[PDB]
Amino acid sequence: TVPVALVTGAAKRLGRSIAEGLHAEGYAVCLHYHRSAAEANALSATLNARRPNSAITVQADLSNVATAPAPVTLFTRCAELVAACYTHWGRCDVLVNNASSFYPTPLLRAMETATADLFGSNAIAPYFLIKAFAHRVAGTPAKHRGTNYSIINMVDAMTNQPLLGYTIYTMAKGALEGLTRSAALELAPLQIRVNGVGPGLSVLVGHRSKVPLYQRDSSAAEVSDVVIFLCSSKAKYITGTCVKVDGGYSLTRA
Amino acid sequence: TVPVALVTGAAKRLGRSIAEGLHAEGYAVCLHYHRSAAEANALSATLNARRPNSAITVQADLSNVATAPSAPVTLFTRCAELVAACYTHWGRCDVLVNNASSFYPTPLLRREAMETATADLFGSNAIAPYFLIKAFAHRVAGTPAKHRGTNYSIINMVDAMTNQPLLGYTIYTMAKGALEGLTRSAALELAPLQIRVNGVGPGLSVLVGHRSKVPLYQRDSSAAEVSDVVIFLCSSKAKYITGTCVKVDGGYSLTRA
Amino acid sequence: TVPVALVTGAAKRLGRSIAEGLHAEGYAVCLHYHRSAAEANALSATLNARRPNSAITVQADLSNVATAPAPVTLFTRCAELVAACYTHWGRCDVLVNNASSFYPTPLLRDREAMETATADLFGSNAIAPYFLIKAFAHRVAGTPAKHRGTNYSIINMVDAMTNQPLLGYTIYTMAKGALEGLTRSAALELAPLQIRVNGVGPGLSVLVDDMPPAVWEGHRSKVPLYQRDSSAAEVSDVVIFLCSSKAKYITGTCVKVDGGYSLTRA
Amino acid sequence: TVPVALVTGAAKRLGRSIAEGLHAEGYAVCLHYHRSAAEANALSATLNARRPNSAITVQADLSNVATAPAPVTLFTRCAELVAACYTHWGRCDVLVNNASSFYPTPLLRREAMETATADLFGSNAIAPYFLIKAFAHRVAGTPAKHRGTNYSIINMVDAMTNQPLLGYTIYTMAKGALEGLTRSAALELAPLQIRVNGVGPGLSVLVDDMPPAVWEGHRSKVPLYQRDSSAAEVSDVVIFLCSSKAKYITGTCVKVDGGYSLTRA
Ligand SMILES: NC(=O)C1=CN([C@@H]2O[C@H](COP(=O)(O)OP(=O)(O)OC[C@H]3O[C@@H](n4cnc5c(N)ncnc54)[C@H](OP(=O)(O)O)[C@@H]3O)[C@@H](O)[C@H]2O)C=CC1
Ligand SMILES: NC(=O)C1=CN([C@@H]2O[C@H](COP(=O)(O)OP(=O)(O)OC[C@H]3O[C@@H](n4cnc5c(N)ncnc54)[C@H](OP(=O)(O)O)[C@@H]3O)[C@@H](O)[C@H]2O)C=CC1
Ligand SMILES: NC(=O)C1=CN([C@@H]2O[C@H](COP(=O)(O)OP(=O)(O)OC[C@H]3O[C@@H](n4cnc5c(N)ncnc54)[C@H](OP(=O)(O)O)[C@@H]3O)[C@@H](O)[C@H]2O)C=CC1
Ligand SMILES: NC(=O)C1=CN([C@@H]2O[C@H](COP(=O)(O)OP(=O)(O)OC[C@H]3O[C@@H](n4cnc5c(N)ncnc54)[C@H](OP(=O)(O)O)[C@@H]3O)[C@@H](O)[C@H]2O)C=CC1
Ligand SMILES: O=C1C[C@H](c2ccc(O)c(O)c2)Oc2ccc(O)cc21
Ligand SMILES: O=C1C[C@H](c2ccc(O)c(O)c2)Oc2ccc(O)cc21
Ligand SMILES: O=C1C[C@H](c2ccc(O)c(O)c2)Oc2ccc(O)cc21
Ligand SMILES: O=C1C[C@H](c2ccc(O)c(O)c2)Oc2ccc(O)cc21
């Protein structure tokens, strides 16, 4: 029988690679997107042409704001993301919190949008998603649960060496790290594993020559393959961990 | 000549110990409070009686919500206003201690309650500290270099034990994680203005069971056992220290179940 | 043509499981052992049965002491372990530093004990891996570039729980700390040769039941995920993954395999 | 009556400043040295002039080798360093493991080999272990009514060893070991109220023997102050962790690095 993965920010780049890698392992994939509707749908078309009934796409803004229909809260929109898996395939085995906004929030020379957007997508939405994922599992009768529940948070290998001017983003990745550890401890009784993967420089649009390994940013596969392994039954003893995929970049000093 | 400290959640417990310790070094202290008006004002009375015009108190809800006034007033404005209060009253703000921290369960395993918890926990512990630091920094940057103080220090109160999370406290644990990130990012970016940014993480302090589990002394800390560390990190002897965290937990993070 | 793995302490438990997992991927394996000669030979028969000439065994004390021949240093014993791979199969692609001694060295209450403990605990957990990495790297550097393999990888078996020290095990915990510094230092310095160096740190894995059963049950019950120790495979599969081409951007890291044990507090 | 501090590598640089700082708080100081006899002796002269019988000097090689006789072990040499405090003043309250060897051991290219491992691992990790063990033994053997009331051990570790200096593998491993000792000793020695902490400099009193451009180069990399630290900028932190105000702190490391560890290449 066929497991289901929910992948946020799945339309392009690492999220796409993650969805493709999970698809190749036999997963049906729910492809979340925000603005990249055409890329999400083209992705879904490729994958459904490969195996019918193996991809859907769902839209949501994961910023921490109310949207239009009572206003719709982020919590609700997160619970509905997970509900789309259960509605279409009756299960949700893997969650990958990949979607992320990333832009400067300088301390030294509006703010309310940056805060909602950078914290929502990077931290608050992952928490609501993990909470909805777990409620669904706890509400499944023990005999009917899957046997390999796995949540991956995409964190950042370099946030201990902060990028100058990216405070809110760096704070939100730090919160997402605390989510990995607290969610791994609390959800262990349900056998839901929760882990982090931290890219260094991946698929850049010249820090890249500073990467000790190969002196380049990584490909998308070089990160997504790690995510796929941590979701595999071979990784069943791994929880509350964080795997850097950074080519040694976090080893460098100015 | 007299430096000024702003201490959030200053009315009781570690915040009061911190404001007392800074006061003892000669600081004037702005005592921020939320609901503890009576406790804050009693503290300010004591300090003012000891040294006239050495304490004020200022009220603010550091939850990430709008509050009642034109338009409603955002967290950002209330945070700027706290820093402004020190500049208004005393012409300076040398030290900021981000101590205010709302703490209660947010279980993942079983909502008006969760919008509230998110705003309150993610606010007091992480978002308000960010806007406070930004307002602190704006001020210094806007002060002519010749008139700047010589010892700017920001202290974030974090948690020695959040790498070993307390079961059921996810949002609070996330918010302390964000606050650790703020310490390292602000330390790097504010270094050109010589503004130092460090963390102090208590383990168990002034508990109101696990106390027996602390390797050193088998008890929680007193308030001064934490606040003395804060005061050291704000002293000129600590001027090469930035971007770092000091645990004050009597070895509790060393323990495994 | 067939890649080669050296696995120290490979006779039993996790080192055996590592050697088997690498053999299953198609590596030829040099199984190092110290006193478990019968177990190493047994395992070597099994692998050589699945696939002829794909396992050998080599004996070495990896304690930081000179042995009987002029006297033989630890360094020389480590260079010879790596040489054995090259002599027999013309290459060494993978090194797994797994061999480890582990016993109490209390700070609080014969100096023979104290002496030999330091040499044995540091040698096997830290100094031999240093020399082994040095020898592995000198060989790769000494290979004409055209003839180099395309996936060199060193795994160092660390401990997920050494930041929460086991009471009474100071020297062991210090040695594991040196071994984490070796991972980071060797990763940085060997990056130009495309040699990845990563850590795997098992928490409670194949716990020997050699005390009252309440103590074995009590230990296991503390692990958040499954309330048990791991199987050997649950660790060795991570080792295998990190040596595979799909891990080729991963270096200088440490993967904990601990069921969330390091998330706990007393 | 007067508390006693044992400082290793006390003769120059940070160890000298730690010794002076502790002395300035009223400590008697046992000044350990290996080659810098003239410096150690001058320091003891200064401290003894300031306060009679407040300093002594003791010489020991802290490399993990046996020395000139039956050979003397690094273990015995460390117990005797502790015993000198007890023989002269009857106590030892503070131990600062400051002595340190630091030089390349490249992975990529005879008695230079074996001597490097012994010297780098000895000074930075194994001698700190035997010193802590001796220090602990002496406290456990003291009747509780005669115990000091503020025992503190400080290990000098390195803020930057997680971003390893290229070519310095043995050194970086030795400091990793010493961080392990901080955490395991703090756990084990907590029942005797002996606190065990680390202080990690980044770039402190950077030595002058390179071209000025290269010296200014290194310094300019530190976010805070674009300079290396003074010796007192590190030693003040050491002294604060030894003070009774720090009595709830154990098993922790304090970085004194001007934010150098927050950088990336
Ligand atoms: N690539 C790199 O070098 C690094 C990546 N990372 C982390 O790895 C993960 C993936 O990286 P990468 O593939 O580069 O990610 P991208 O920066 O390409 O962003 C991923 C997706 O996030 C979605 N997203 C952004 N904001 C929101 C929002 N408010 N609501 C909903 N979705 C949103 C976007 O979806 P849409 O396009 O549909 O609008 C976007 O495609 C991220 O979590 C990132 O933080 C960390 C360090 C370095
Ligand atoms: N005590 C301990 O053992 C531990 C403490 N810590 C940290 O140390 C610091 C001090 O601890 P402790 O003294 O026990 O702190 P408290 O738990 O007593 O909290 C301090 C003050 O924070 C203020 N506060 C709470 N919510 C808000 C809000 N929404 N807006 C404004 N202010 C608010 C309250 O002010 P008022 O009373 O005026 O409403 C409260 O008095 C905190 O940052 C805490 O997280 C970390 C781990 C353990
Ligand atoms: N199992 C666990 O719970 C944990 C394991 N680890 C680490 O994982 C690795 C594997 O664990 P595990 O399988 O339990 O290991 P073991 O304790 O079973 O020991 C591994 C092997 O190391 C070899 N060894 C010991 N001392 C020496 C020496 N002086 N010279 C050469 N070889 C030596 C022994 O070989 P021989 O039998 O041939 O003498 C032994 O079989 C080790 O590095 C360990 O420290 C870390 C934390 C927990
Ligand atoms: N300065 C810096 O920027 C940094 C310093 N540190 C750490 O801080 C501490 C103090 O630093 P610093 O003042 O620079 O230290 P030094 O490099 O100046 O060394 C201090 C003393 O160690 C002694 N020593 C060296 N080898 C041996 C040995 N085999 N046995 C006995 N003693 C020995 C020497 O004593 P003698 O002269 O008497 O021979 C030397 O003066 C050290 O632990 C260092 O590792 C860490 C990172 C950066
Ligand atoms: O593509 C990037 C590079 C960008 C980056 C660029 C340069 C760096 O040195 C560095 O650490 C990170 O990091 C990201 C963080 C979030 C995200 O969604 C995308 C990226
Ligand atoms: O008083 C406490 C104890 C409480 C606590 C209690 C028990 C623990 O094991 C632990 O880690 C933490 O932590 C706090 C966190 C924030 C705060 O504002 C107050 C406290
Ligand atoms: O087999 C074990 C379990 C043992 C162990 C692991 C975790 C514990 O809490 C504990 O009490 C004991 O740790 C080891 C360390 C090194 C080693 O080579 C083997 C082991
Ligand atoms: O003097 C130094 C500076 C030196 C140093 C520190 C930071 C650097 O970037 C660098 O290149 C060199 O580190 C040391 C380590 C041990 C020691 O005993 C002394 C020193």
Author numbering:
A (entry chain D): 5 to 73, 81 to 120, 135 to 230, 240 to 288
B (entry chain C): 5 to 73, 80 to 120, 133 to 230, 240 to 288
C (entry chain B): 5 to 73, 81 to 120, 132 to 288
D (entry chain A): 5 to 73, 81 to 120, 133 to 288
Lines quoted from the article behind this entry:
The classical inhibitors of DHFR have reduced activity against Leishmania and Trypanosoma due to the upregulation of a gene encoding the dihydronicotinamide adenine dinucleotide phosphate (NADPH)-dependent pteridine reductase 1 (PTR1). PTR1 is present in Leishmania spp. and Trypanosoma brucei parasites, but not in the human cells. It is able to reduce both unconjugated and conjugated pterins and provides a metabolic bypass to alleviate DHFR inhibition. PTR1 is a functional homotetramer with four catalytic sites. Each subunit has a single α/β structured domain with the typical topology of short-chain dehydrogenases/reductases (SDR) and is characterized by a seven-stranded parallel β-sheet sandwiched by three α-helices on each side, that represents the classical dinucleotide-binding motif known as the Rossmann fold.
Moreover, these experiments provided the first X-ray crystallographic structures of LmPTR1 in complex with chroman-4-one derivatives (compounds 1 and 3). The orientations of compounds 1 and 3 in the catalytic pocket of LmPTR1 resemble that of compound 1 in the TbPTR1 active site. The chroman-4-one scaffold establishes a π-sandwich between the nicotinamide of NADP+ and Phe113 and most of the interactions with the surrounding residues are retained across the two species: the hydroxyl group in position 6 of both compounds is located within H-bonding distance of the β-phosphate oxygen atom O2A of NADP+, and Ser111 side chain. In both compounds, the carbonyl group in position 4 is H-bonded to the NH2 group of Arg17. As in TbPTR1, the phenol moieties are located in a prevalently hydrophobic pocket lined by Leu188, Leu226, Leu229, His241 and Arg287 (for clarity, leucine residues are not labelled in Figure 3B–D). In the complex LmPTR1-3, the involvement of the m-hydroxyl group of the catechol ring in the interaction with the NH2 group of Arg287 is visible only in chains C and D, whereas in chains A and B, due to a flip of the catechol ring of about 120°, the p-hydroxyl group interacts with the side chain of Tyr283. On the other hand, the crystal structure of LmPTR1 with compound 3 reveals a binding mode different from that of compound 1. For example, His241 lies at about 4 Å from ring B of 3 and is part of an alpha-helix adjacent to the substrate loop. Irrespective of the compound in the catalytic pocket, different conformations of His241 in LmPTR1, at the corresponding position of Trp221 of TbPTR1, were observed in the tetramer, indicating a high flexibility of this residue which delimits the catalytic pocket. All three flavanones show a percentage of inhibition of LmPTR1 greater than 50%, with compounds 2 and 3 being the most active (IC50 35 and 36 µM, respectively).
